[PDB]
Ligand binder design. Structure first.
Ligand SMILES: [Zn+2]
Ligand SMILES: [Zn+2]
Ligand SMILES: [Zn+2]
Ligand SMILES: [Zn+2]
Lengths: 162, 167
């Protein structure tokens, strides 16, 4: 019974992930200077990214958690709030338009989508991603909270399966 | 206003880092050459969990359960085949009364794991309703209202890198 990293190759390093999350936090801090934002974590895969991001935010903040299959967030938490959805990966954009439809129906003041990883191949249609840490090639990736069969979430880096 | 303004630091992000390193080295050693399924108790334990798993070096499966305080457990992502005849460690943010503790042991244990341990970042032994066997504890704390590092009040304060007291 061996550590899961030996089955993987580094694709994006943990230091590279730390610099992108810093960049993203500086950006959110600036765009929402003196305002309040509700950050929405899309479980399960965004949890590690979310844990690292929220610690570098310096604005008034509320945090909420949902899953993709929950489209569920209450109207009281959406109506007239600034929402930012925090996702691990956008591939087709099927999940995206479902989160932007099911939340946008309770009329937030603003609604933005951030993803750690974006895979532009097989994109459904027109998707507005307000924040992207990494635009990656069309590859099966694990680590930094993203799993395969409940393995690899624990890796501090984004990896390929050998 | 940033929520840090109305808090005071109680446990620093450096103290946390060091406790989580210590816990990871205990688990790495205790389970050397074994597989473990770690169960994260959402929502509060997500940040502790994110940091802990990154320092583990054993063969791992991760699973998720949500506890809401009456305690309701929801099996967010917890499947019988990663518990039955496996080594489980439950990862929790705080034990205060021990009520959630025994409901978790009962809810996971009914799938008949081979072993079942409980880890908690914080233990507040005041107002315990029962005796508990905590396998791992990062910090035994005083009876105070604490927040941060994952722990909320009405969806506030999770973002703090430290455990804070409220002013
Ligand atoms: Zn996702
Ligand atoms: Zn679709
Ligand atoms: Zn808890
Ligand atoms: Zn009880």
């Amino acid at each position: 019974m061996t550590y899961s990293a030996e089955n993987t190759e580094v694709y994006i390093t943990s230091q590279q992930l730390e610099q992108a999350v810093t960049r993203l936090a500086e950006q959110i801090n600036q765009d929402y200077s003196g305002q309040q934002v509700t950050l929405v974590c899309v479980l399960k895969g965004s949890f590690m990214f979310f844990a690292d991001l929220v610690r570098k935010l310096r604005i008034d903040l509320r945090t909420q958690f949902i899953t993709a299959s929950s489209y569920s967030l209450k109207e009281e938490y959406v109506k007239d709030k600034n929402i930012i959805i925090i996702e691990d990966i956008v591939d087709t954009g099927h999940t995206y338009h479902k989160l932007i439809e099911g939340i946008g129906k309770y009329n937030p003041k603003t609604l933005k989508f951030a993803t750690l990883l974006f895979k532009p191949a097989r994109l459904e249609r027109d998707v507005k991603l307000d924040y992207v840490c990494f635009e990656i090639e069309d590859k099966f990736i694990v680590g930094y909270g993203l799993d395969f069969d409940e393995k690899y979430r624990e890796l501090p880096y984004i990896g390929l399966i050998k």
